[PDB]
């Protein structure tokens, strides 16, 4: 399972969608049209094909400076 951030079109996306591909909602952003989701590592391509999904971005790492 991997964590991914999906930029969505709210007119065509529903958070209940992600269960359909074996994933689940971690966090829905209030301030930007995006949702954090855990998906099976092998379902990323499938997620990019899901309704209302505009961009799928891996969760990158920052470090203390």
């Amino acid at each position: 399972t991997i964590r991914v951030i999906v930029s969505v079109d709210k007119a065509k996306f529903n958070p209940h969608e992600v269960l359909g591909i074996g994933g689940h909602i971690v966090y829905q952003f209030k301030l930007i049209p995006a949702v954090v989701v855990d998906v099976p590592a092998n379902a990323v391509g499938k997620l990019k094909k899901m309704p209302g999904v505009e961009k799928v971005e891996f969760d990158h790492q920052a470090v203390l400076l």
Partner: protein
């Protein structure tokens, strides 16, 4: 507890002469520090910690257990901004400013971009969970709301992600000054988020006014970032280096600017842009009052130069 000293970096950025005007204790003003969390009971910090929140693993928790510093880095960065002016320890640039400690990095000082974005939103929303409660489009500086006026990010990554940037844009449009470390790889340009136009990228100087060799180049301004004594857990003090130590000096300077300006005018200044060289914008003020080291003008080492709070505040008020 040791008797109080003023660390060399605080002196270098010309903070102590500001304190008769303000120490940043203007009630509408808070600085959100997105880091490893905070030693929230530290005797030299506690009184200034207004809110403690964590966004680790994509869940927002306001519990002290979850927001406490498990690394030391957050505590150190927070003391450079806001260690109290009293009889012990150290003193921050803005020793009366309220701090929101937003834990986006884990015990090992590593963080996911998702958690950082959610951290940025916490700084906009504030303890009340609402960005703009009276719906007037004023967020930072609105005494009816509880948004931070500065977001300080002593952290960085190599990725430019659409959604993190969207969140930076939201903070910027809320009137929040965003300040971030340039990075510690001696690279030719800053890390993200410092590298975004909306964000002040900060480089590190040492006590000889030389740019630190590790400091990522092309910053916007530079500040003390080598041999920086500040608070450290548990209820102690430690000396560290890096662009993460320089960043809070600049965040403290912005806090002083916006505090002084609100104290006089009952408003705050616009954030401004990288190119600004006017007095009408926080960033323009920072740029024109900065100590211009190295070659004349902006340069790839120091940016515009070393920030100077005394002069910045005078430019704000005059």
């Amino acid at each position: 507890q040791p008797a109080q000293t003023i660390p060399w970096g605080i002196e270098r950025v010309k903070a102590p002469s500001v304190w008769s005007i303000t120490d940043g204790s203007v009630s509408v003003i808070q600085v959100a520090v997105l880091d490893t969390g905070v030693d929230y009971d530290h005797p030299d910090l506690a009184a200034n910690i207004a809110w403690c929140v964590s966004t680790l693993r994509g869940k927002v928790s306001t519990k002290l257990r979850d927001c406490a510093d498990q690394n030391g880095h957050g505590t150190h960065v927070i003391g450079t901004i806001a260690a109290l002016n009293n009889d012990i320890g150290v003193v921050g640039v803005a020793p009366g400013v309220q701090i929101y400690s937003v834990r986006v990095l884990d015990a090992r000082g590593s963080g996911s971009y998702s958690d950082i974005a959610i951290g940025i939103a916490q700084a906009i929303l504030g303890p009340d969970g609402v960005a703009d409660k009276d719906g007037d489009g004023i967020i930072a500086g609105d005494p009816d709301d509880d948004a931070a006026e500065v977001i300080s990010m002593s952290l960085g990554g190599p990725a430019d992600d659409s959604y993190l940037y969207d969140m930076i844009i939201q903070a910027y449009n809320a009137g929040i000054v965003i300040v971030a470390a340039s990075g510690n790889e001696g690279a030719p340009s800053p890390s993200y988020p410092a590298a975004y136009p909306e964000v002040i990228a900060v480089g590190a100087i040492d006590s000889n006014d030389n740019i630190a060799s590790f400091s990522n180049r092309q910053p916007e301004v530079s500040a003390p970032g080598v041999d920086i004594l500040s608070t450290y857990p548990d209820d102690s003090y430690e000396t560290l280096m890096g662009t993460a130590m320089a960043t809070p000096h600049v965040s403290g300077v912005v806090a002083l600017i916006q505090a002084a300006y609100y104290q006089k005018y009952g408003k705050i200044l616009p954030v401004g842009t990288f190119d600004d060289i006017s007095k009408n914008t926080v960033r323009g003020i920072l740029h024109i009052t900065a100590d211009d080291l190295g070659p004349t003008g902006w340069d790839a080492d120091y940016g515009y130069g070393v920030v100077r709070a005394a002069l910045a505040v005078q430019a704000a008020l005059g």
